[PDB]
Amino acid sequence: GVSVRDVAAQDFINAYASFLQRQGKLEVPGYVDIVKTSSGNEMPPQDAEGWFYKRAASVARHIYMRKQVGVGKLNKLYGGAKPYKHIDASGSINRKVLQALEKIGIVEISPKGGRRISENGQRDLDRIAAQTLE
Amino acid sequence: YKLDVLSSVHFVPKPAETPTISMEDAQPLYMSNASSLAPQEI
Amino acid sequence: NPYGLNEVDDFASKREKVLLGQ
Amino acid sequence: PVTLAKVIKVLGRTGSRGGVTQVRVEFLEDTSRTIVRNVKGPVRENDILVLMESEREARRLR
């Protein structure tokens, strides 16, 4: 009965980010400590240890909300203002995250392109969703 | 009348020697004509 | 129109068909 | 000590200076007693104002 949308967005991402950190099976690129996630930003994320997993926490939820998602959508989704230019988020990190998730089985290559929420992942996201509520 | 009948939402009735009696008077009977004139008019 | 169009309303129709024809 | 007075009539054509309104007020302590006063803010009837001095009589301020 529990669903991801039934849980607060902030609570779910922090909880499942911790689970991903605790799980230890998410592949993390080496360059995480030296990247800033965009051109509009200025300095790398402060929570160097866990931002990548929590970055994976956010996109995995978006893939639940929207059945099909691509790297371009995530780039605009995490993009921000800089006249203003509205540069999109870094392509490399989003692509690595999507590859990282489907290794765990949370997501998988959607038809007609993009990533779909895997039924195993869908149950997994619901699992942590119930965890936060309980 | 006929145009009023055709254009009226509600019922419109049809509009209607020897000494003649005045059924209706413009002013009350006890009132006099002289009392009807202002001092300026006089 | 069953019973014809008024003079104002004939005029606008003539304008409409001309624009439609264009 | 301080008295409270309820406005009963907002006088007009008083020749008061701009932003000043001459009012007449009935003291709450003694309803009968009336005093004419000068007020700075927007004012209406039935409103209560504070008088530290209850002896001065309002003189118009041009």
Next chain:
Amino acid sequence: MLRRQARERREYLYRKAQELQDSQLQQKQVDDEYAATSGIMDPRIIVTTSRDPSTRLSQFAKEIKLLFPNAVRLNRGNYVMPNLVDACKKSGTTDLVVLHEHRGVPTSLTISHFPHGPTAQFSLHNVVMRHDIINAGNQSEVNPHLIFDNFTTALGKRVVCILKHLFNAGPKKDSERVITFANRGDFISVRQHVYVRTREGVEIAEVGPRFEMRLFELRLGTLENKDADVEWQLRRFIRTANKKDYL
């Protein structure tokens, strides 16, 4: 309500057509929009500007307000054009004046006559506002006398009709204030003067502002209706445009 405006617009588009035919037959008076209220009801004018006006355009709008005796200045903060025209039509205004600028330089002036047009658009050149005058003082707001010079063509008479009724009818014979619109090669010079009759002539002093106004569009409808039929428009890319006169 929406059935009012639709029906009346259709009547108006017809009435102008009949008036045009009647004039053409006469070719072989006051215009219909203004004939109803000509000299009966004093005009009611609203002067406004474009969104986020500069300080100068607000100053220029104020000067235009002083030019017309029955004008009121209205701030256009976020107002939507259908809402602006609809709200003004509710209030019973006769005319709406909208002003545009470029870096604090008045560029355009558009006049729309309610409830059903016409809309006249003008371009402002060599604009001089009275705020450029030191120790100028205050204006006189009596009803001006009007002087129109060198308006000959039918379009010229049309522009005369629109500008005439922005002011009140029946100025006093001895009013010291005169407003003049002088046509010179389609560039109408607008000047405002205060006069005194001397024992051997008349001496005039200008109050300002100075600006040259040229018509470039005239449509049969309110300024909102971008789809309103165009009564007249200025063609510039025509080979004869460099020497063609219309007014």
Next chain:
Amino acid sequence: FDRTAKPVPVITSEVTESLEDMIRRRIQDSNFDDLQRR
């Protein structure tokens, strides 16, 4: 080269003098084009 459009006029003193003479002449005769009550 030719120019497409009519050049924008300049209000020189002679034009100002000519304009002012017309204004003065009109008021000498009281020939005013102003709206009147009907």
Next chain:
Amino acid sequence: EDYHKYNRICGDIRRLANKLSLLPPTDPFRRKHEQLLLDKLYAMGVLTTKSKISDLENKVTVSAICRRRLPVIMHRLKMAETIQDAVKFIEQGHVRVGPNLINDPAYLVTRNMEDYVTWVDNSKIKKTLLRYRNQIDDFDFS
């Protein structure tokens, strides 16, 4: 279809203007009386635009009166596809002109009332409109 009644109206208007043509032109009553006729026909909607007397002589026709009939007018307003069908709703009581419903087809609407015609608020006919547009608001009861 019988037009004897409207034919009476047309002629009765013609006889009135004719006999007014007989009176002296300078008579104030004649000029006054005519202006009431030109106003009355304009108000009824028989005249789309203000006219003169000779125009009343020829402009007035049976078709003008029939055009003002409520069955005809809703057809122009596209309320009903067909006139006999239009006669049905008005006899079926789904039509209101102003604050009063009219169940009589023979009613003609004046120029001012020409536009206030619409359906009654609780008419099922009106619900089918808003339901297709998906703008049906049950709070307005319509």
Next chain:
Amino acid sequence: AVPSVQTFGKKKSATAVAHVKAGKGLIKVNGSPITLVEPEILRFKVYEPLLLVGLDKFSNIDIRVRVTGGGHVSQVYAIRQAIAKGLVAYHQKYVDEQSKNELKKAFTSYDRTLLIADSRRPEPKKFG
């Protein structure tokens, strides 16, 4: 068919469509529960009918609200207007009119905007 009613609430460009049917006290906005509406600071605003008339009335119904257009604040007001409107329309269509009158009285007594469109149409306060 299941008894149901549809109502609209509008604020500026924001428009909210509320469907109120028989149910078990399930309230959703944009497919998510009313508790997760954002901004949290203004959350109580959208809660505000729910508390005024009491949650017992809602326990027997399902409300689904879909919001589009406008900003966050205008969307909140569209939601609250739509909820109140669908509420009262439901108790009219499938419950007594006395309850309807009580609901209208309570809402209007506290704030009439819950039931009315609040449209600040331009007004030329300056005469002329």
Next chain:
Amino acid sequence: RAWDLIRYRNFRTFTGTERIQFNCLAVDPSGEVVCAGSLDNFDIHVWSVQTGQLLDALSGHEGPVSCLSFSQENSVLASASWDKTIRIWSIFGRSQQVEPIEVYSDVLALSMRPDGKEVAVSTLKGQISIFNIEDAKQVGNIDCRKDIISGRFNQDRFTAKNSERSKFFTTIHYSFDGMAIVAGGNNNSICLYDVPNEVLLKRFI
């Protein structure tokens, strides 16, 4: 037309510029301003009783003005229309203000409380809604549709219960005591309501 009843004479006549048909009239308590409304102009004509001239026309309604009423004490003018709104005019004074209040349906009748603090209006839905003039907020409402009695017409092809011919009141008025309203319409019923409790005191055939 103004009539002096002590001398039974029409001492004045007022008219519009274009002969506007008038349906409603209200007069200043001071007897110096008279206002009329029309179904064709959407505008309130104002005259001076002493002079007979048109002071000005109060514009702002989109709909035909159905009714007018001056406050006996506060002298505020309340106007209602088929525009689904009500406007309070503060004509007297250096500056004039208009306070529009929107309503569920077309207003057919309007009455002014003798105190002048409240206004009641009858709508096409069959609702008597009372509003506070100074605060411009509603204070009460009365249902009317059920209490009204309307008989099926011999030419009507319908049941009276389904008929929507007249389930609204076209006229209303307060009691001078101010706790009751008498209402009438195009129907066979006069209903007397109690404003504070919003209940039917009695109905008359």
Next chain:
Amino acid sequence: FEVVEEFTPVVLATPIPEEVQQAQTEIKLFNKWSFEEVEVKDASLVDYVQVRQPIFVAHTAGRYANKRFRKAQCPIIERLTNSLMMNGRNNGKKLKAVRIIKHTLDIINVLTDQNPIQVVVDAITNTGPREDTTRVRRQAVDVSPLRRVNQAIALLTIGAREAAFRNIKTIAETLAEELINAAKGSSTSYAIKKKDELERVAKSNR
């Protein structure tokens, strides 16, 4: 004697927090401060410091500028919020004002166990000047209670803003300090100083 309107426990398919239910019991500012016990101590300020209508949050989207005296009926907390946002950079940002007031009320509760809404009412009552001067030199005149409320709100907001403009203290804590001191009547609050100076100047020109 009892009256019961509910014979079945109310459970909603959509879970609602129990705090929201306790708010169903009573209207309470931010679910956290009540309007039942608040009273304006000074009689004159009554009818212009409006606290009888309880509200969850400051925002109301009300129309109070249209006639001359709707501002009296506006809730005092909302008037405060409207006054906090200023200086251009903060213009139009009422949500930040709401956040600031909630944090200030929390601070006022922490420092003083009294009710922060009562503290605000007391501060407005205390810091309202009771006479002022008008330039003719100067002459002493009375002040309308709406002007008293207005100068009170303006003075408190301005003092709190200026105190923390370039100070370690944030806006919320300085606002809470100003409100507490004004309620106490201590001279430490800037608004009390200004009020006393105005009344003194009026006394001199009396």
Next chain:
Amino acid sequence: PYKIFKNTAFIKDMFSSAMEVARFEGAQIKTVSGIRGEIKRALSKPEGH
């Protein structure tokens, strides 16, 4: 042309500097299709546009 917005369009390679454009403000221009046009103003960047 290199940027076209309905009738308005930006042109290049006709002039080398904005100074050259400044004199030819007001001149006629036409396309091979015969569309008569006009020089409105020199663009500050790049030169000649």
Next chain:
Amino acid sequence: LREKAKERNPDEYYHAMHSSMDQVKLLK
């Protein structure tokens, strides 16, 4: 078309108002 959209009576009524990829094609 714009005037038709502009001048549309909202109140108008008409009686029409009341009313493997390859394997998928064979199935339907």
Next chain:
RNA sequence: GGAGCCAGCGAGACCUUGGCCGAGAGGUCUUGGAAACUCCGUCGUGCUGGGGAUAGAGCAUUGUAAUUAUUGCUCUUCAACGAGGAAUUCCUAGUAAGCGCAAGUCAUCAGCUUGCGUUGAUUACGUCCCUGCCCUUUGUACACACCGCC
């Protein structure tokens, strides 16, 4: 630094959904033709983690045939500016102000013009006391009432 997210205007090869590379800029392979704002965190009265001018070194794009400029990205360098004199301009509700988005539709406009939407106030809404601009001083005005030779 992260996350959470809400608009309305707009349609006469190039755009594009999606995959793969790169920290970014930006490349490569294919299919069809919004911000402000809200939550949690780090900072902190220090010209400080505000400010990004100038300067150096690189990684790329666009033409074009030059080692020519052009437009972006990475690092380092880190200036004036600490609320602005005399004076002066404007402003009353969806208004002042903040915020972004779109089209350049015969005049004017090319980071300028217009339009669209989002957040949204304080104060006053009373006065002729000062200033300025006007009206009247044959009731002429149909009753009552008020007035009474500038």
